[PDB]
């Protein structure tokens, strides 16, 4: 008997969604595959609406299948994978997958990527590891996974703590598992939410303008993430505006433009004095995901920093 | 006789039996006696700010200083914080007309901490500035025993002493026992080969940076447009793509004469011309391998020469 | 009250062994530190004798202390760390540490490395993770840890599955733990052994000579590890000699000269037909360590391959 | 008109509506029709062996072939297995006298497998060989959309399609939409700049490779010495250090005229001269950034010109 695997498509086909078993016939060797098109967007236009639709669809469909494969554009797959990692309560494998080359282009990466994603979704050993991304023969956790290169087929890496397992000949040797709390160990429950808190991201650099930061504060954003320089440091005029945000009802999280390493609490900036949160290893777009969800439960920066310290 | 090397300091000491004085750079030199073995060192404290508050006016003061003092010394080392070094290095790479080595240096640990990186990093920067073979390679960054070109160099890790790398095209050479095996030189045009001359400039064109992500707000890109910014750099997703509403604001801006450069939040690889975005229809410029903060430096300088998007693209193709 | 930490020195001082608390006085803030010089060799001369002396000394001294820090030259620290990972039955932190710069050289890395190693040995959270290496603000597992660069202070990486935790301001955020069985979950017991099986390593390349391989076979080695090309492939004349070794009493393990990735069982070479074992992610010098210990229990290649599949 | 490019095949097809013939390289070309868009392609099957059984005689046949046929074509692509490509590429880098592009290519997946890398890799190798800007950069490796110099290129991962990298000095350029932005060229002397001429050679000097590790046996290094090998490369620990008993055998050998090169099992960085080992006392040569298999290629060729350890070191300093 082979596992039942639901492929949820968010966009264009990566090898329509009901044809994938004929476009990649090897799938019939490993699974009984059923396809649903949940939405159809370019990944560069991903949004909160699509996030909620997916977490609700997986949590509702958990009983109907043995595992999920989500097909998704590469540009924001790291964002969607972490949102799902925190909001999904289904304990069955959820595996995200995309393609750095078009399906019609030479040596297209989609077919094998889809095959390997199905392998991962079918593997008993894949349960209880949080939401996964499978790209380039590798199983990565939805928390640390990011894109490292604009075009490379091998772009997706877990740049801080590394991959969970490598896939060879339809087999996974898992050697690691994310200790950070995920899926049904989080208190984030989006079953009844139809919007998320307003969180924007502002960039730091030499002679940075406070205008982006002031635009979000004047819009009344619930949250702002700073893509800091070095260990989450802030250009003076940005630092001034955020200091104002934090004492007037905008949660402020210090992340980093630097691609690897933690932004560490009270090391470069007096977080306690300013009412700021340090993102740790969460890059600015991941720290947005968790800020949004922290803001569904609390606006107390000491409670948001504890959230940033276990999820 | 030993070469004459100037240290130009922009902030704190990265290193440090001697009396501490009021001048940071004078304590620095006493903190690293072995410098006497390789150079006649002279320090000047140009400014004293944290690198997280680096700005246009420090960039103008340094380029002008290096250009003015070129005949006075055999080389320059600049002590600089790590957070924005990659931006200042590229600025100086495009605007220095001196063909003597200009080497930037910093440290990821405090000078007081255990196993402070600053003292050795400074020694290796002076080694580099003293090497006749360092000349005509552009402005350089020397960190963790490695020579990095100012164009491609970036910080990869928030705390690692080894964070500085040329993430696309790799290092120029490695330093062992005070000697450099140079195997590489940047092909993009730099220093006396660029048309950018900052010698009479008081100020630089205004260029802001917007981030793209899921559900991105247009409000940062609108704020820059309403302030009438000369240029905006987009930190795009994947190969420079933009969120729909950010796209919409920047498409309108380009139409009314804002210069728009697509860069990427992705830490390696080119944002390539007309690939994910018809740059020709919109009047956008692709940044190449330049990261958002690096593309800002080139866009500011491009805008001193031209406001035409097609000439700006050819600039982003040559420098 | 502060933890009791035993520093075992194998060689020259990295900041004599009883002075380290005065050379790095910050240690008195985190631990009560006692030093023993177990042996004094250059790490390039490391050997089986020194291995057994250490595992016996730690297993015997486990009751007398809260944790161990071993000071060791960088050239073979990856070898000693895995030997100890497999042979130590003490459940208290054992942390290996060295220095890529001399203690007397400018910006010497030893002091902080020693401090951070003591931090790791003192951390409750460090128990039960196997034998650790702490280099360059990073906690790495003794299985995957290797040197990547001849001179860099940041050389030590876990190149396949990544680090366990990063150390900031005397604090570890552990986010990973090796799933491979270690310490008291292995059957390797060296308490009564005074030598180990004879295992040598032979290199593959274009026009490789069979002479190295034939020298080990004629010496009657218990084991040979091949540093294969690509996915553990063998130059014809090497392949011929090893095929002969395996059917006449020499266990043969296929590793790789390639610095990352597994040598995978029966993918490039018919392991079952030749009586060979595939090393997986174990590089040639690590696969030697585990072959030596597998050979203390069995000479059946199917039993050695199962050993290579869980340790 | 399109450039004329020769494919020289050494084994299996890396790619593959057509009739399959007995000649691998003829099936290869039919398997990648889009080649017609960029080149007039002509294939020759030079040899047919697995790359794990690469040898001196294939290296001699290829260099001689490229050198002989240089006037007949605009460029060369060599199809080669991945396991030893890095060795053949460097051999050809030192012995090709043709200054037209020579591009090596392979594939990490089977041509039959899903998402086979071979077809696109071959297209990108032909693109590279067809680019006038590829010339005078040495023998090249093109894999996963990247141009790598034959000196520094190596395989980093047993299975990854992205395994090939220039791990010390980085890539020469990246390929996007059939176009290469070259930002780098190898400074070490290659091709028509080396003194190695293989045109009359029937065979190469015998050079073996010994591994170092804890408790290393001397028996491999003794076997090579007793066979009277012209040279031995040591895969040292850290910065080329040797286990005591391996040291002992190689010290004795060097004394009786065996050439001894210290390389390292460590996958990046230089093995540096008189640093961890007094090379002057022992008559040893430091390999630099060359890995053991790369140092063997240069040592074999060094030994066609000289057996003096000091001249061999200067060769390891220049090529």
Residue numbers in the entry:
A (entry chain B), C (entry chain B): 0 to 14, 31 to 326
B (entry chain A), D (entry chain A): 0 to 15, 24 to 326
Text taken from the publication that reported this structure:
The genome of E. coli encodes three L-asparaginases, called type I, II, and isoaspartyl aminopeptidase/L-asparaginase, respectively. The active site pockets of these enzymes are shaped by two protomers, one of which forms most of the active site scaffold, including all catalytic residues; it will be referred to as a “major” protomer, with the second protomer called “minor”. Yet, as we demonstrated here based on the reinterpreted structures of EcAI and the new structures of EcAII, under some conditions a citrate ion can be accommodated into the active site cavity and even displace the canonical substrate or product.
The remaining five structures of EcAII describe its inactive variant with both Asp90 and Lys162 replaced by threonines. The remaining two structures included in this report were determined for crystals of EcAIID90T/K162T grown under the same conditions as EcAIIwt-apo7, discussed earlier. In the first case, EcAIID90T/K162T-apo7, diffraction data were collected from a crystal first transferred to the cryoprotecting solution and subsequently frozen at 100 K. For the second structure, EcAIID90T/K162T-Asn7s, a crystal was soaked for several minutes prior to freezing in the cryoprotecting solution containing 10 mM L-Asn. A blob of electron density was found in all active sites adjacent to the side chain of Ser58. While in the case of EcAIID90T/K162T-apo7 this density is most likely attributed to the α-carboxyl group of citrate, in the case of EcAIID90T/K162T-L-Asn50 the origin of the electron density remains uncertain.
